[PDB]
């Protein structure tokens, strides 16, 4: 009804003023407009390739968009366009043409909405602007790991909820499965910190790698290191959770003391409020009536059981991005001892192609990680955000947390990255069978590549009790016993 009023002609003695978004530029025609004021800023979906974050940001429009804004004032008669930027910024910062949205997307997202429409053929589908065939094939594979697509490439129940989230599938995965044991306030805080960026100023940036100052840096890091010895993700949870109780007058003092970035943390505060609403809208039953309060954001320190579960939800998003220590898979392939520093301990990704020399596949810990100041041996299985070639010596690791054996299996159970062996028989390994399609038995799960598949590098997890039901001749697992 309101856009009926704008299209309704003005009263006599009154000049018309309309104020709107790009929709007024192109979507519709405004009769009688002789003056157009151009801010030059529009909010459009943006995908960040380096950190894989999808967001909606206010930024400069393309040169074509600005011209369409200026031609608006000249439909009925000669008019004037007043741009709130200069020619120089128009020449340099305004791109000639707006990029297609398909190029401003996660590739996993495009297939997700594409599959949410129940369209089978993604690889051969005639895009106006096709993404690379290789880019697509990875995207389908990533969603299958996220459980959004089943074995037959069809969207699953996780998938339909996955499409409803406007975020990237990786982050939307953790938010969906996190509605257990009141762990939602913690998980979004990670998502907010990860989505916006790292708020920790490291020693190298500080140039202190003065002897009193480096200690204060160490004390500040140690103060945020109580949640978990082996995890860097929860240290990010410490600052964001500790941020909220820092009153308004104590922001800057808190920030100078802790060597953190002010403008970054305030943003994270805003993302949490926005992020919760998206989750509580889809998850809750009164999707649109829900409203966020700062009190819901506020929460106390996680319990040890809650910490373990949080490690599970984080790994749920990053099942593919999980690394193993090399000695466990290949003993003596790389010499290791207690003398070797932690930063020099090799690790292997699960989907790393096996090269003739296994040393090439190795990845190593970043010095800034909490795992550096640790001393004793690091854990066998690591979860990481991504890999960075930075550092000429070795590839470095953006670690999140440490995941144990059985938790990793139950998380990969939904995904296709985990395979199960045949029923184990032997000492105390009788296979219980209730019906011809039903049985309860021990199985050693295999995570990663199949034993036949030598191209990729899979490994075997610890044996675990499990319930299986036979479906289409396949002994599908139901739950670990």
């Amino acid at each position: 009804k309101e856009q009926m009023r704008v299209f309704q002609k003005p009263p006599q003695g009154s000049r018309l003023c309309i104020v709107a978004t790009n929709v007024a530029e192109t979507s519709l025609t405004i009769p009688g407009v002789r003056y157009v004021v151009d801010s030059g800023r529009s909010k459009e979906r943006k995908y960040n390739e380096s950190n894989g974050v999808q967001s909606f940001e206010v930024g400069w429009v393309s040169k074509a968009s600005a011209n369409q804004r200026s031609g608006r004032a000249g439909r009925t008669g000669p008019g004037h366009c007043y741009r709130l930027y200069s020619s120089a910024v128009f020449e340099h910062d305004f791109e000639q043409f707006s990029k297609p949205e398909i190029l401003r997307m996660p590739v996993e997202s495009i297939v997700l909405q594409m599959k949410s429409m129940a369209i089978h053929n993604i690889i051969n589908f005639p895009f106006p602007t096709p993404p690379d065939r290789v880019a697509l094939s990875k995207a389908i594979q990533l969603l299958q790991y996220l459980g959004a697509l089943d074995n037959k490439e069809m969207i699953t129940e996780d998938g339909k909820k996955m499409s409803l989230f406007p975020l990237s599938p990786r982050f939307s995965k953790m938010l969906l499965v996190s509605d257990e044991k009141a762990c939602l306030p913690y998980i979004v805080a990670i998502v907010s910190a990860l989505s916006v960026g790292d708020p920790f100023i490291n020693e190298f940036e500080l140039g202190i790698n003065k002897k009193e100052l480096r200690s204060k840096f160490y004390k500040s890091r140690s103060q945020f290191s109580k949640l978990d010895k082996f995890s860097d993700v929860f240290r990010l949870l410490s600052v964001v959770s500790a941020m909220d109780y820092v009153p308004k007058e104590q922001k800057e003092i808190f920030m100078k003391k802790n060597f953190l970035r002010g403008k970054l943390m305030e943003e994270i505060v805003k993302l949490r409020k926005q992020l919760m609403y998206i989750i509580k809208s889809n998850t809750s039953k009164e999707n649109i009536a829900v409203v966020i309060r700062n009190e819901d954001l506020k929460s106390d320190i996680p319990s040890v059981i809650q910490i373990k579960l949080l490690k599970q939800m984080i790994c749920a998003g990053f099942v593919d991005h999980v690394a193993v220590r090399a000695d466990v898979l290949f003993p003596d392939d790389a010499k290791i001892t207690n003398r070797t520093s932690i930063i020099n301990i090799p690790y292997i990704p699960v989907l790393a192609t096996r090269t003739p020399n296994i040393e090439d596949c190795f990845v190593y810990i970043h010095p800034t990680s909490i795992l550096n100041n640790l001393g004793e041996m690091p854990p066998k299985y690591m979860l990481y955000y991504s890999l960075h070639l930075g550092g000429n010596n070795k590839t470095r690791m953006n670690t999140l947390c440490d995941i144990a054996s059985t938790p990793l299996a139950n998380i990969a159970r939904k995904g296709l990255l985990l395979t199960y062996s045949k029923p184990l028989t032997g000492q105390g390994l009788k296979t219980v069978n209730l019906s011809p399609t039903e049985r309860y038995c021990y199985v050693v799960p295999r995570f990663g590549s199949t034993v036949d598949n030598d191209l990729k590098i899979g490994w075997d997890l610890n044996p675990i009790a499990v319930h299986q039901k036979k479906q289409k001749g396949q002994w599908t697992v139901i739950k670990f016993i």
Binding site: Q223, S238, S241, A242, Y245, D300, I301
Partner: peptide, 4 residues
């Protein structure tokens, strides 16, 4: 606080 516990976090601090």
């Amino acid at each position: 606080n516990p976090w601090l």
